[PDB]
Every structure is written in structure tokens, then in C-alpha cells.
RNA sequence: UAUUGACGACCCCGAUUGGUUCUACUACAGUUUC
């Protein structure tokens, strides 16, 4: 799963939260203007765009302080073993040897298909039933591939530079990020292809927060969380973040505007 | 319009039991084992016109699933919850073999695991990192269904919701027929005889009384002799 | 005028987006010889 994909789902939920709070509609904007909203411009970053905003000429672009890694499966296959899957031609024929190979059950298809399972789908015509002419398709569903933990790296130094040093200003950005992670753990952020079509819903078992050199008022972040609702973060800390967050909701200024 | 496979109401006890037995030639409580391909000469008709299934999900098994919904208006949400809260003995039809009676399912809500809020409720939820209480939507559930029912009454102008033609028809699909006649493909013999000459009901119909397929809401059965 | 007489499977992917926007050179050394 590319980090591009995991970043993009996180960004989308972060924006929906911000726009929801402000009740700011997204429908009349083109895509480059849809992306450009508060706090996410600092966390996820913004396109370079020069503007003569005030006779002064300024760049709106800044890099994302939040970076995401590609997430790979624990399962692995030799390069030719997968080339046997890409080049199978009979779902009940030569595909079955290839998946038995790649899933690591070369003699046991009923275990092989607990890892990668071919699915067939039809579109069913609404007057006749049966199936719509041409509308038959199939999916190799990785029903049982196990995945390694997702790594998100938040550059606190880069945000703090955007806010011209003021660590008070981190709390709305940190508050947003924790709200995004709360939804991820509550199955509110599906990932990958076909999310509305039988794929993409993840269970989160544990979020580990491990910062280095955090400022002392953010030091409570260093935690391993297993409650989806963040209840493993200190209530005084969650209540502090809620306060700085609510104070920003009451006036959602461009927080890096000095 | 939209084709639907009415629920096979009133199939007798044991109809799905012991399914390898070729009961198709005998009317147990008046139903032939209509889902089974008859044996011919006492051997199984594994012809290339049909499939065979090694097993099936037993009746009364149970599944849970969740529906996650975004920005549904009270009319669009009202329609959905009506389908999930149809009165008793309404059943949805799922999966394959529906003409043969397979795949009838009962849907109902688990209200103790449902959490619907309007966007103003989510402004509160995303307002704080502390736990903040959800609305008890079960007070509203009846309001939403009526928003749907009145919109259908209003647009498809009718003196009742249940008198709207696609509503009345859809009800009989979900509920099945009540006249206790069997559901099977048209055939000119009561038994499913092993050769399966269903076409000759249509030729008897064609030379004879030329019945059209009755209206779904009328619950009118075809005669076995359409002549 | 209305007879003749029983067989048989089908669909195999379809539609679409295929790059969009910003930066396009900026500082200089322009003659040197204690
Ligand atoms: Mg296909």
C-alpha cells in the first residue's frame, strides 16, 4: 500500500473534519482549491503557488510536516512466483497452481485460498435478471494477507518553524491529527480499492506514539494506545488539546500567519 | 419494470432437509422438491444445463454486517431504514438460486450498535477529544420512515403509501404469495417430470387462452392447463 | 382448418480520468600588476 494512498485517505478525513466544523462546502471548488484548507496546509502540505498577495509577492507552498511510508505485506513471493499469477489464464486451470505456489501452500488449495481468493462478480440486468451482457469480472482478493504496521512520521520541527516557534500553536495541529487517528481506529477511514464494494476496512489493534525531543507540554504523547478513543492519553492532556482545539474552532485563523 | 423473485411462502417442514433424496416426484404436503433436478431412470441428471452445489448455508444461520452511510437526507435515510425494519414475515432475496426458493433472508437492525448523527451532531463530536454523548436516534427512526412514506405518497400521488403501485408490488415480493399455490416454472404437468418440457406449457398457452403474467400485487396464479 | 416434435445453455469485463498548478534563472567578478 503506497504511502501516497495512506496519506491521501488521512488527508481526506482531516479536511472533512475541518470543513465539517466550519460547515464550509467543497462542491464549487476545483480540485486544487478543494485541497487548500486550514491546518492541513501545514500538516499535509500545499502546492507551490506564487501570489502577489499584498503588493508583496509570496509563495503559498509548503512541504508536508507529515510524511507516510509504503506499507508492505508480511507475506512475500519470489518475483517469478508472482509472474506466474499475473500470467495465469484459466481461473480454474493454470491459475490454481500459481496461487498455491505464491500463497505458500503448494499442495493445499483450501489453505491457498484463505490467503488470496479469486472472486467473480456479475452486474444483474434490472428487467431480466441473469447478468448484463459483458458485465462479468473477477478480483483476486487478498483476504488473508497480513500487513506490517503503518509508519507515520510527524516532523514537529517543521511545524514549529511554520508557526515561527510558538509551541502553543501546535495543539490545534496535534489535536487534528489525534482526531484523524481516532477515526482510523473506528473503521471510519477505509483504505485502497473498492472501499464501497467489499474491500478496504481495517482493524487497528494498537497505535504507538513515540516522539523524540518533544516540547515538555507535548511530552505526554509518548504512549502506546490500544483504546480507539484515545483514552490511553492522559485526560488532562486530552483536555488541554481539546481546549486549544476549541479555541481555534471559535476562530479558525491561518495559524501560521504571524 | 424491475423483476423480482417472490419469497417462497409456506414451503413444508423438511423441504430443505435430506436434500439428496429425489423427492421431486412426490407431493409432500402439496409441494414437489422443486429445487432438485429429477433423477432419470434412477440416475442423477448431471447434464450440462445445470450446476450442482456441494453444500449450502443452513437455514436459520445468522450474519452480522454494518452499513456506514454519509449525508443521507431524511427521505433517503427513511427509505433505507424501512427496508431494514419491514414488519414480520417480509424477507429479502439474496444470492443465487432465487427462482428455486433459495436465499430468503430476514433483515433487522441492532439498535444497540447503531450511531447516526446529523452534521450538527458531528460538529460536537469532532469538537472535543473527550468522550461526548451520542444522540439516541431510536426516537427519530419512526420520524425518518414517515418522511419517506409521505414523500412517496406525495410524488406518486396516492391516498395511501401502501397503495403506491411499486410499494404494493414490492410488498408482495418480500412477503410472498398468500393463495398457497406453489411457485415453479410454467409446466404442463404437476410433477416436475425428469425431461423438463417446460416449453409445452407455453405452446398450450399460445394455442389456448394466451394468459399474460398476472400483476404481482394481484396474487393470481397461472392454471396448469392454460387452455 | 391447425397441425409437426424436443431440445438447449449464456455472459468473460464495460465506461472514464492519462497529467493539473507554481518556480523559468537569481546574486555577482567587467579587467588584473605594492
Ligand atoms: Mg472479465
XYZ file of C-alpha atoms (C1' of nucleotides) and ligand atoms in Angstrom:
520
model
C 0.000 0.000 0.000
C 1.853 3.129 -1.093
C 2.348 5.922 1.362
C 0.662 8.071 -1.258
C -2.526 6.113 -0.663
C -2.338 6.147 3.124
C -1.509 9.841 3.125
C -4.425 10.564 0.820
C -7.034 8.819 2.940
C -5.747 10.566 6.070
C -5.744 13.955 4.359
C -9.298 13.437 3.139
C -10.638 12.725 6.623
C -8.653 15.590 8.112
C -10.199 18.014 5.612
C -13.695 16.638 6.109
C -13.348 17.263 9.838
C -12.170 20.831 9.293
C -14.828 21.603 6.683
C -17.487 19.984 8.853
C -16.616 22.161 11.827
C -16.721 25.287 9.657
C -19.620 23.967 7.526
C -17.546 25.071 4.551
C -18.757 23.455 1.354
C -16.330 21.856 -1.080
C -18.539 21.463 -4.133
C -17.974 24.695 -6.077
C -14.156 24.475 -5.881
C -11.918 22.805 -8.419
C -9.602 20.110 -7.059
C -6.549 22.318 -6.472
C -8.705 24.737 -4.480
C -10.513 21.922 -2.685
C -7.250 20.685 -1.201
C -6.277 24.074 0.229
C -7.756 24.380 3.746
C -6.507 25.298 7.221
C -4.150 23.194 9.351
C -3.984 20.597 6.589
C -1.923 23.108 4.640
C 0.749 22.697 7.328
C 0.366 19.020 8.215
C -0.122 17.570 4.759
C 1.372 20.497 2.852
C 0.431 22.729 -0.024
C 1.408 23.192 -3.643
C 3.853 25.899 -4.515
C 1.913 28.885 -5.799
C 3.363 32.383 -6.020
C 0.954 35.196 -5.163
C 1.346 38.987 -5.181
C -0.915 38.872 -2.155
C -0.314 42.434 -0.947
C 1.998 44.066 -3.469
C 4.410 41.868 -1.607
C 4.944 38.638 -3.521
C 4.574 35.443 -1.504
C 4.642 31.697 -2.027
C 1.712 29.692 -0.627
C 3.644 26.433 -0.980
C 4.978 24.464 1.922
C 6.094 20.870 2.314
C 4.073 18.482 4.437
C 5.256 18.220 8.003
C 3.546 14.808 7.958
C 5.217 12.013 5.938
C 3.985 8.448 5.359
C 5.830 5.246 4.386
C 4.836 2.488 1.986
C 3.321 -0.441 3.892
C 4.305 -3.922 2.715
C 2.783 -7.325 3.351
C 4.377 -9.803 5.714
C 3.790 -12.417 3.018
C 6.318 -12.481 0.195
C 6.803 -14.252 -3.128
C 9.731 -14.688 -5.465
C 9.469 -12.393 -8.488
C 8.743 -15.300 -10.853
C 6.194 -16.783 -8.445
C 4.091 -13.657 -8.845
C 4.756 -13.525 -12.576
C 3.009 -16.903 -12.607
C -0.041 -15.234 -11.058
C -0.038 -12.244 -13.380
C 0.124 -14.620 -16.359
C -2.398 -17.265 -15.387
C -5.196 -17.534 -17.919
C -7.715 -20.053 -16.529
C -9.215 -19.227 -13.160
C -9.878 -22.907 -12.507
C -6.881 -24.045 -14.541
C -3.280 -22.862 -14.501
C -4.176 -20.127 -12.001
C -4.628 -22.708 -9.264
C -1.015 -23.939 -9.352
C 0.227 -20.334 -9.390
C -1.706 -19.277 -6.284
C -0.805 -22.477 -4.462
C 2.815 -21.582 -5.191
C 2.613 -17.932 -4.141
C 0.471 -18.381 -1.040
C 2.945 -20.946 0.292
C 0.573 -23.921 0.243
C 1.754 -25.606 -2.951
C -0.233 -28.758 -2.174
C -3.263 -27.365 -0.311
C -5.529 -25.038 -2.280
C -8.073 -24.741 0.523
C -5.351 -23.019 2.544
C -4.035 -21.170 -0.500
C -7.478 -19.582 -0.973
C -7.500 -18.445 2.638
C -4.727 -16.026 1.638
C -5.536 -14.950 -1.930
C -9.081 -15.772 -3.039
C -10.433 -15.202 -6.566
C -13.894 -13.670 -6.602
C -16.345 -13.418 -9.502
C -18.919 -10.670 -9.864
C -21.848 -10.008 -12.196
C -23.939 -6.996 -12.960
C -27.538 -8.231 -12.992
C -29.841 -6.569 -15.523
C -32.826 -4.964 -13.787
C -35.620 -6.162 -16.116
C -34.469 -9.645 -16.988
C -32.229 -10.723 -14.148
C -29.489 -13.036 -15.175
C -26.464 -10.926 -15.999
C -25.874 -7.863 -18.095
C -24.170 -8.668 -21.385
C -20.444 -8.207 -20.931
C -20.589 -7.368 -17.215
C -18.668 -10.329 -15.759
C -15.446 -9.610 -13.873
C -13.235 -11.111 -11.189
C -10.993 -9.927 -8.363
C -8.001 -11.529 -6.674
C -8.920 -10.562 -3.140
C -6.064 -10.671 -0.610
C -8.475 -11.861 2.062
C -5.702 -13.163 4.306
C -2.508 -11.215 3.581
C -1.104 -9.906 6.853
C 0.322 -6.399 6.836
C 3.112 -4.706 8.742
C 2.427 -1.676 10.991
C 1.950 1.656 9.202
C 4.646 4.264 9.936
C 3.640 7.934 10.012
C 6.407 10.424 10.801
C 5.359 13.858 12.091
C 8.115 16.471 11.796
C 7.500 18.632 14.868
C 10.482 20.802 13.941
C 8.940 21.672 10.568
C 5.596 22.674 12.078
C 7.269 24.663 14.814
C 9.186 26.526 12.101
C 5.913 27.224 10.270
C 4.457 28.627 13.470
C 7.558 30.779 13.954
C 8.414 28.795 17.072
C 5.195 29.122 19.041
C 4.556 25.699 20.586
C 1.157 26.897 21.741
C 0.189 26.751 18.050
C 0.995 23.038 17.801
C -2.047 21.998 19.796
C -4.663 22.589 17.080
C -2.489 20.686 14.590
C -1.805 17.911 17.112
C -5.487 17.939 18.052
C -6.491 17.446 14.419
C -4.041 14.579 13.972
C -5.366 12.744 17.013
C -8.937 13.153 15.728
C -7.874 11.637 12.401
C -6.294 8.701 14.224
C -9.451 8.261 16.314
C -11.450 7.709 13.121
C -8.865 5.382 11.636
C -9.261 3.132 14.660
C -13.072 3.354 14.459
C -13.242 1.948 10.884
C -14.199 5.406 9.584
C -11.249 5.513 7.168
C -11.234 2.607 4.711
C -8.178 2.136 2.535
C -7.462 1.063 -1.024
C -9.622 -0.137 -3.889
C -13.283 -0.914 -3.740
C -13.994 0.555 -0.332
C -17.716 0.741 -1.129
C -17.613 -2.656 -2.861
C -16.488 -5.131 -0.239
C -12.915 -4.104 0.467
C -10.810 -1.749 2.459
C -11.961 -1.810 6.084
C -9.175 -2.165 8.636
C -8.989 -3.123 12.283
C -6.432 -1.128 14.268
C -5.026 -3.062 17.215
C -2.535 -0.546 18.568
C -1.206 2.943 17.898
C 2.228 3.601 19.343
C 3.187 7.253 19.743
C 6.958 7.660 20.059
C 8.283 11.183 19.854
C 11.832 12.355 20.371
C 12.779 15.708 21.905
C 9.125 16.764 22.107
C 8.460 20.060 23.907
C 7.550 19.457 27.501
C 3.863 20.233 27.102
C 3.645 17.641 24.300
C 5.719 15.059 26.187
C 2.546 13.180 27.269
C 2.217 11.968 23.659
C 4.881 9.289 24.191
C 2.456 6.433 24.695
C 1.198 3.145 23.329
C -2.548 3.365 22.759
C -4.941 0.465 22.383
C -8.282 2.114 23.104
C -9.554 3.534 19.796
C -10.984 6.548 21.613
C -7.561 7.797 22.790
C -8.475 7.117 26.410
C -4.869 5.988 26.928
C -3.736 9.606 26.558
C -3.888 11.454 29.864
C -7.238 13.114 30.378
C -5.503 16.316 31.411
C -3.568 16.191 28.152
C -6.613 15.305 26.066
C -8.484 18.058 27.872
C -5.682 20.547 27.168
C -5.673 19.682 23.462
C -9.462 19.932 23.423
C -9.180 23.449 24.839
C -6.649 24.729 22.306
C -8.653 22.984 19.573
C -11.954 24.504 20.684
C -10.298 27.926 20.881
C -9.258 27.512 17.250
C -12.729 26.330 16.210
C -14.070 29.560 17.701
C -11.794 31.480 15.303
C -10.207 29.331 12.572
C -7.412 31.726 11.569
C -4.472 30.783 9.340
C -2.465 29.583 12.274
C 0.944 30.199 10.654
C 0.026 33.827 9.918
C 2.397 35.761 12.185
C -40.371 -2.946 -14.756
C -37.978 -4.395 -12.172
C -38.000 -8.195 -11.958
C -38.220 -9.764 -8.508
C -38.400 -13.318 -7.252
C -41.228 -13.594 -4.705
C -40.476 -15.319 -1.439
C -41.471 -18.996 -1.496
C -44.001 -18.728 1.307
C -45.165 -21.859 3.053
C -42.680 -24.483 1.961
C -43.356 -27.534 4.145
C -41.383 -28.980 7.032
C -38.314 -30.895 5.882
C -38.452 -29.426 2.381
C -34.772 -28.473 2.553
C -33.915 -31.456 4.746
C -32.330 -34.618 3.398
C -31.730 -32.853 0.088
C -30.031 -35.718 -1.747
C -33.286 -37.697 -1.730
C -35.121 -37.404 -5.077
C -38.486 -36.476 -3.576
C -39.345 -34.417 -6.691
C -41.910 -36.994 -7.901
C -43.983 -36.861 -4.688
C -46.170 -34.065 -3.294
C -45.133 -33.785 0.341
C -47.847 -31.511 1.780
C -48.519 -30.461 -1.823
C -45.003 -29.253 -2.675
C -42.677 -31.095 -5.019
C -38.975 -30.890 -4.235
C -38.768 -28.191 -6.834
C -35.112 -27.236 -6.319
C -33.783 -30.716 -7.209
C -33.132 -31.897 -10.732
C -35.074 -35.154 -11.057
C -33.299 -38.436 -11.456
C -33.846 -40.140 -14.785
C -34.078 -43.932 -14.778
C -32.769 -43.679 -11.225
C -29.509 -41.905 -12.038
C -28.559 -38.298 -11.433
C -29.144 -35.788 -14.232
C -25.827 -34.014 -14.040
C -26.437 -32.620 -17.516
C -24.528 -29.577 -18.733
C -27.625 -27.390 -18.431
C -27.411 -27.240 -14.640
C -24.924 -26.847 -11.799
C -24.581 -28.830 -8.610
C -23.699 -27.434 -5.184
C -21.613 -29.346 -2.656
C -23.212 -27.577 0.291
C -25.200 -24.593 1.340
C -25.535 -22.232 4.265
C -28.137 -23.782 6.526
C -31.422 -22.011 7.141
C -31.520 -20.017 10.387
C -27.816 -19.306 10.225
C -27.097 -15.708 11.027
C -24.740 -12.987 9.846
C -23.964 -9.529 11.122
C -22.849 -6.713 8.869
C -22.539 -2.955 9.184
C -23.690 -0.178 6.864
C -21.739 3.079 7.008
C -23.683 5.989 5.476
C -22.787 9.566 4.584
C -25.011 12.633 4.192
C -28.284 10.781 3.673
C -31.296 13.087 3.803
C -34.259 12.015 5.907
C -36.015 10.779 2.762
C -33.041 8.759 1.520
C -32.350 7.506 5.038
C -36.015 6.890 5.700
C -36.249 4.620 2.672
C -33.235 2.629 3.814
C -34.433 2.062 7.377
C -37.836 0.972 6.125
C -36.125 -1.862 4.253
C -34.212 -2.780 7.394
C -37.346 -2.685 9.577
C -40.001 -4.307 7.412
C -42.690 -5.971 9.529
C -42.593 -9.654 10.332
C -42.697 -12.185 7.513
C -41.154 -9.826 4.994
C -37.980 -11.338 3.566
C -35.312 -10.119 1.181
C -33.899 -12.377 -1.510
C -30.155 -12.887 -1.635
C -27.645 -14.692 -3.779
C -28.242 -17.424 -6.293
C -30.953 -19.919 -6.982
C -33.692 -17.445 -6.158
C -36.172 -18.947 -8.664
C -35.842 -22.272 -6.822
C -36.587 -20.827 -3.372
C -33.033 -20.328 -2.116
C -31.697 -17.210 -0.465
C -34.559 -15.687 1.515
C -33.147 -13.552 4.348
C -34.623 -11.576 7.241
C -33.059 -8.166 7.938
C -33.425 -6.248 11.186
C -31.404 -3.572 12.965
C -29.222 -3.897 16.066
C -30.118 -0.522 17.624
C -27.643 -1.001 20.491
C -24.751 -0.789 17.939
C -26.056 1.965 15.621
C -24.794 5.534 15.822
C -26.346 8.058 13.408
C -25.988 11.822 13.831
C -26.543 14.773 11.551
C -23.689 17.051 10.633
C -24.508 19.326 13.556
C -24.031 16.335 15.832
C -20.645 15.637 14.255
C -19.567 19.228 14.835
C -19.957 18.365 18.508
C -18.183 15.021 18.261
C -15.215 16.451 16.376
C -15.285 19.423 18.744
C -13.554 17.589 21.577
C -11.079 14.788 22.248
C -13.034 13.767 25.353
C -15.942 11.374 25.082
C -19.169 13.213 24.310
C -22.547 11.529 24.239
C -24.311 10.368 21.084
C -27.983 11.102 20.405
C -30.477 8.305 20.955
C -31.522 8.069 17.303
C -34.191 5.459 18.123
C -36.564 8.297 18.976
C -36.181 9.607 15.408
C -36.270 6.324 13.496
C -40.050 6.482 13.145
C -39.850 10.103 12.018
C -37.480 9.245 9.175
C -39.594 6.401 7.828
C -42.604 8.711 7.680
C -40.629 11.331 5.791
C -40.076 8.638 3.173
C -43.636 7.327 3.251
C -45.143 10.803 2.871
C -42.793 11.700 0.004
C -43.807 8.545 -1.880
C -47.478 9.269 -1.173
C -46.998 12.853 -2.291
C -44.989 12.479 -5.503
C -46.556 9.249 -6.777
C -49.834 10.815 -5.798
C -51.798 8.330 -3.753
C -54.318 8.195 -0.935
C -52.087 5.749 0.943
C -48.457 4.730 0.987
C -49.264 1.022 0.613
C -51.441 1.797 -2.406
C -48.484 3.124 -4.400
C -48.060 0.562 -7.127
C -44.351 -0.150 -6.721
C -44.888 -0.226 -2.945
C -47.819 -2.628 -3.137
C -45.955 -4.798 -5.650
C -42.726 -4.733 -3.638
C -44.639 -5.807 -0.548
C -45.926 -8.943 -2.273
C -42.423 -9.774 -3.492
C -40.972 -9.554 0.014
C -43.926 -11.240 1.649
C -44.549 -13.928 -0.951
C -47.887 -15.075 -2.232
C -50.748 -15.923 0.114
C -53.002 -18.107 -2.094
C -50.940 -21.231 -1.145
C -50.250 -22.121 -4.799
C -46.767 -23.473 -5.474
C -44.061 -21.447 -7.196
C -42.406 -23.248 -10.098
C -41.595 -22.590 -13.717
C -44.538 -22.988 -16.081
C -45.008 -26.619 -16.987
C -47.851 -28.671 -18.411
C -47.710 -31.311 -15.669
C -47.989 -31.012 -11.883
C -44.954 -33.149 -11.205
C -41.597 -31.959 -12.391
C -41.144 -34.823 -14.824
C -37.481 -35.668 -15.425
C -37.377 -34.486 -19.062
C -38.282 -30.936 -18.066
C -40.520 -29.983 -21.011
C -41.453 -26.584 -19.602
C -41.852 -25.095 -23.090
C -45.023 -27.035 -23.757
C -46.940 -25.047 -21.175
C -46.215 -22.023 -23.337
C -47.337 -23.787 -26.516
C -50.509 -24.900 -24.750
C -50.934 -21.316 -23.589
C -50.172 -19.955 -27.050
C -52.715 -22.046 -28.909
C -55.099 -21.742 -25.960
C -56.046 -18.902 -23.635
C -52.859 -16.844 -24.066
C -52.521 -15.684 -20.473
C -50.211 -12.811 -19.641
C -48.163 -12.982 -16.445
C -50.518 -11.664 -13.749
C -49.858 -8.409 -11.958
C -47.619 -9.006 -8.975
C -49.988 -7.399 -6.454
C -52.949 -9.445 -7.729
C -51.553 -12.763 -6.454
C -53.229 -14.520 -9.406
C -51.835 -17.984 -10.100
C -51.461 -19.456 -13.556
C -53.513 -22.523 -14.446
C -51.593 -25.674 -15.175
C -53.772 -26.009 -18.308
C -53.678 -22.576 -19.940
C -56.243 -23.711 -22.453
C -58.802 -25.532 -40.988
C -54.045 -26.296 -37.128
C -51.117 -29.269 -37.079
C -45.163 -31.204 -36.733
C -41.558 -32.518 -32.330
C -37.924 -31.955 -28.031
C -34.136 -29.943 -27.347
C -30.581 -26.021 -25.245
C -27.156 -23.178 -22.033
C -25.336 -17.539 -21.935
C -22.176 -13.599 -20.197
C -15.813 -13.479 -19.967
C -15.311 -7.465 -18.441
C -17.916 -2.435 -19.804
C -17.421 3.283 -19.118
C -13.789 7.190 -17.556
C -9.678 10.497 -15.787
C -3.933 9.746 -18.673
C -1.400 14.768 -16.173
C -3.035 19.678 -13.430
C -0.801 24.270 -10.968
C 3.678 27.144 -9.224
C 9.142 28.417 -9.869
C 11.835 29.604 -15.913
C 17.232 31.620 -13.675
C 18.962 34.789 -9.017
C 23.474 37.251 -6.933
C 27.826 38.551 -8.775
C 33.637 39.291 -10.652
C 33.531 43.536 -16.185
C 39.749 43.621 -16.094
C 44.443 42.469 -13.062
C 50.116 44.199 -11.909
C 52.958 47.210 -3.897
Mg -13.843 -10.341 -17.063
